[PDB]
Design a protein around this nucleic acid. Structure first.
Ligand code: CA
Ligand code: CA
Ligand code: CA
Ligand code: CA
Ligand code: CA
Length: 754
DNA sequence: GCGGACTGCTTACCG
DNA sequence: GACGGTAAGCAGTCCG
């Protein structure tokens, strides 16, 4: 299985490296054959040799075009003949391009911004992580003596924990007398040992939880300060800390550095992303957190380093268990997209789509359109109409049937051949015209994107069939990950059209998708209301809730099933409506906010404060208990009482602190903010202490007693101590518990609760 | 003047 | 880190 690709420079010539593992042995295949290239559309082929003599200096010396060949290749379907300009070293590409482009003979420079290592994987048609081979993995974690506002790295590492299938152990230089602790003599000697342990085990994968930003960077700062050759690589390389986007990312050449944080963040939706939370979330089993204040006084005292140790050991043990559960699906991802597990792990669905197209485009002889310049993105800053959301018939309704379209936007993208290479073509035999946008899509050639979208959905059914046949539970799991991933990639294509920084951007494509969406949703609703006697209670894009007021639950079911038989033949192409659920009773509050309870008794909650992370857990609990009473039981008085007891408990100061924590994410650099919410006021005072309040950072806080602006009275949950502080018993009753509860119980017009 | 009515910023959800 | 549509709360500024 091809792990990843890289290139070194042997005697001033770029030699490619394909890191593979064949028959339970890591092998490195070199390739000097592959020469870099980039395309160029000259105004007149006559000016080939004239424009071929452009140059500019690199670090070593001057760079000039090695050779050039005029090539025929399709662009948005339309045939085009352009010059591909070969260069000796890939780092000559970024030097020559700007000047070669400015040349008043060439029209534009194309396909110049693809890395060579990634170019090789595409052009050769080599698929990463293909074939059956069990890869050895080692999870590791570090514990540091980082002070309050201490310059990053000055604090020394106290312990290094590593864990795999066999064992979990701690290496440290203070004396923790336990069977899983290895006492070294100095910090230097423990790092020396850790590096040796990694060398001895020689694992294919190194698992971390946010190792990209903290763990690896910190080990470097120390290895510099102490003077240790930080060689974790298989080729004897020190780990490469690249500045990928807002954050950084770290590559251990020869191994897979699998940072769980970015993957877990993308996958799971949690209030906070502590390794304690991620564990308790995924596995359900709890994990205690030995703090920095504790880890410090432990080291300073010597008393009770056994807890500080157990923590470090459990951190690695958990990291391993999380890694072994997440890695497999992130591997099948690598296969589907066709780039390394490393990239696919740290990539947006936005870029995963573009990588998947760049690959298919090469195979189709399609020249890839360039990413937009700064002036272009400004021109793509024009929004478009979304989908229909019906203003809901409010109240408690009985016997609701949920109907929705199966893969709506994809069905449209396929059916109407929606693609930039088909948008308003010249003299096609057949066209499909968008309802209100008016955009006409050529229906002669199967479009680039639709063609691929078909194959994906076409393969997903092949995989779901092979799953039925699969006897091995492991393969049936790995097969489910593939089929599942295909779907999520298939539903990303509408979004990619609207995404400005996308190569294959198309505003009129995205506009037309939503438009057809609006028409078909509205047309279904109209029929179910007219032809059949249903009353559409609420509807969002692609889905609706309805019932037959006064009819029995059985009748609602039968009649809804009868409607699907009627409507589907009337609908065109792949546009098909499906019966998705029936619910005993349901409650619609506002647009995007409602709840329903199924026949078995499982309540389903959408949009209400219960699900939101930026509400006090007392408000989210108090609501869920009121909502349970109204739906599950039916005791409206019980809800009235549930509010009052909870309300009195807070005013008596008997409400636990833990339940009062409010979580609000920091969107941008705190300076850029135009108006200060509490979370901003919390973030700005925390940053004044030299803390790292950066984009992605979730701010926890509690409202302290008093009056005025809520933001000037917010002490972080960690910072908060009971003392004589207490809490703003008013706020949590006035602004949190009551408003949220009121939303549900307002249907029966309740005024005030004690 | 004062304080109730408006309005823009920001967050997190829904599909 | 895709998309647009939506409900809110909090902290400012009108204007009768
Ligand atoms: Ca020009
Ligand atoms: Ca539903
Ligand atoms: Ca099904
Ligand atoms: Ca019941
Ligand atoms: Ca948006």
């Amino acid at each position: 299985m091809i792990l990843d690709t890289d290139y070194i420079t042997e005697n001033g010539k770029p030699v490619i490296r394909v890191f593979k593992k064949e028959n339970g042995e890591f092998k490195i295949e070199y390739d000097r054959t592959f020469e870099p290239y980039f395309y160029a559309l000259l105004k007149d082929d006559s000016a080939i040799e004239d424009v071929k003599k452009v140059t500019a200096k690199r670090h070593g010396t001057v760079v000039k075009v090695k050779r050039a060949e005029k090539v025929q290749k399709k662009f948005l379907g339309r045939p085009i003949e352009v010059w591909k300009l070969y260069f000796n070293h890939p780092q000559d590409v970024p030097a020559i391009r700007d000047r070669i482009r400015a040349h008043p003979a060439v029209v534009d420079i194309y396909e110049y911004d693809i890395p060579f290592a990634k170019r090789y994987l595409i052009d050769k048609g080599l698929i990463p992580m293909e074939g059956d081979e069990e890869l050895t993995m080692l999870a590791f974690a570090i514990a540091t003596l980082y002070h309050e506002g201490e310059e990053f790295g000055t604090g020394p590492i106290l312990m290094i924990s590593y864990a795999d299938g066999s064992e979990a152990r701690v290496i440290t230089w203070k004396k923790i007398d336990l069977p899983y602790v290895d006492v070294v003599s100095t910090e230097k000697e423990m790092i020396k040992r850790f590096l040796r342990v990694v060398r001895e085990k020689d694992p294919d994968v190194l698992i971390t939880y946010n190792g990209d930003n903290f763990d690896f960077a910190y080990l470097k700062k120390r290895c510099e300060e102490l003077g240790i050759k930080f060689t974790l690589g298989r080729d004897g390389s020190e780990p490469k800390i690249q500045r990928m986007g807002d954050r950084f990312a770290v590559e251990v050449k020869g191994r897979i550095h699998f940072d769980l944080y970015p993957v877990i963040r993308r996958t799971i939706n949690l209030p906070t992303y502590t390794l304690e939370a991620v564990y308790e979330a995924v596995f359900g089993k709890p994990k205690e957190k030995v703090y920095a204040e504790e880890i410090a006084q432990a080291w300073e005292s010597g008393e009770g380093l056994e807890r500080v140790a157990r923590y470090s050991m459990e951190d690695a043990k958990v990291t391993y268990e999380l890694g072994r559960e997440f890695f497999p699906m992130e591997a099948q991802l690598s296969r589907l997209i066709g780039q390394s597990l490393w990239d696919v792990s740290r990539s947006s669905t936005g870029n995963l789509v573009e990588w998947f197209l760049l690959r298919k485009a090469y195979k189709r002889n399609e020249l890839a359109p360039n990413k937009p310049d700064e002036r272009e993105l400004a021109r793509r800053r024009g929004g478009y109409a979304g989908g229909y959301v019906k203003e809901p018939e409010r109240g408690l309704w009985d016997n609701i049937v949920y109907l929705d379209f199966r893969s709506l936007y994809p069905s449209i993208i396929i059916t109407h051949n929606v693609s930039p290479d088909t948008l308003n073509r010249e003299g096609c035999k057949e066209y499909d015209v968008a309802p209100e946008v008016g955009h006409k899509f050529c229906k002669d050639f199967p479009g680039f994107i639709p063609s691929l979208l078909g194959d994906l959905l076409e393969e997903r059914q092949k995989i779901k069939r092979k799953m039925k046949a699969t006897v091995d539970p492991l393969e049936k799991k790995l097969l489910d990950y593939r089929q599942r991933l295909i779907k999520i990639l298939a539903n990303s294509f509408y979004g990619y059209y609207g995404y400005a920084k996308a190569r294959w951007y198309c505003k009129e494509c995205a506009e037309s998708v939503t438009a057809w969406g609006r028409e078909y949703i509205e047309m279904v609703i109209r029929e179910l209301e007219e032809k059949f006697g249903f009353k559409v209670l609420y509807a969002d894009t692609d889905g609706l809730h309805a019932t037959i007021p006064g009819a029995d639950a059985e009748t609602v079911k039968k009649k809804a099933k009868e409607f699907l038989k009627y409507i589907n033949p009337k609908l065109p192409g792949l546009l098909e409506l499906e019966y998705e659920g029936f619910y005993v009773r349901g409650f619609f509050v506002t647009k995007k906010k409602y709840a329903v309870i199924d026949e078995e008794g499982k309540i389903t909650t959408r949009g209400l404060e219960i699900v939101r992370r930026d509400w006090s857990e007392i408000a989210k609990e108090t609501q869920a208990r009121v909502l349970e009473a109204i739906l599950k039981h039916g005791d409206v008085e019980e809800a009235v009482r549930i509010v009052k007891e909870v309300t009195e408990k807070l005013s008596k100061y008997e409400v636990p602190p833990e339940k009062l924590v409010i979580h609000e994410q920091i969107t941008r650099d705190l300076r850029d903010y135009k108006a200060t919410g509490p979370h901003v006021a919390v973030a700005k005072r925390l940053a004044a202490r030299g803390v790292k309040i950066r984009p992605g950072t979730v701010i926890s806080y509690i409202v302290l007693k008093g009056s005025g602006r809520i933001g000037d009275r917010a002490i972080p949950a960690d910072e908060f101590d009971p003392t004589k502080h207490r809490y703003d018993a008013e706020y949590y009753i006035e602004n949190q518990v009551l408003p949220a509860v009121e939303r549900i119980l307002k249907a029966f017009g309740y005024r005030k609760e004690d």
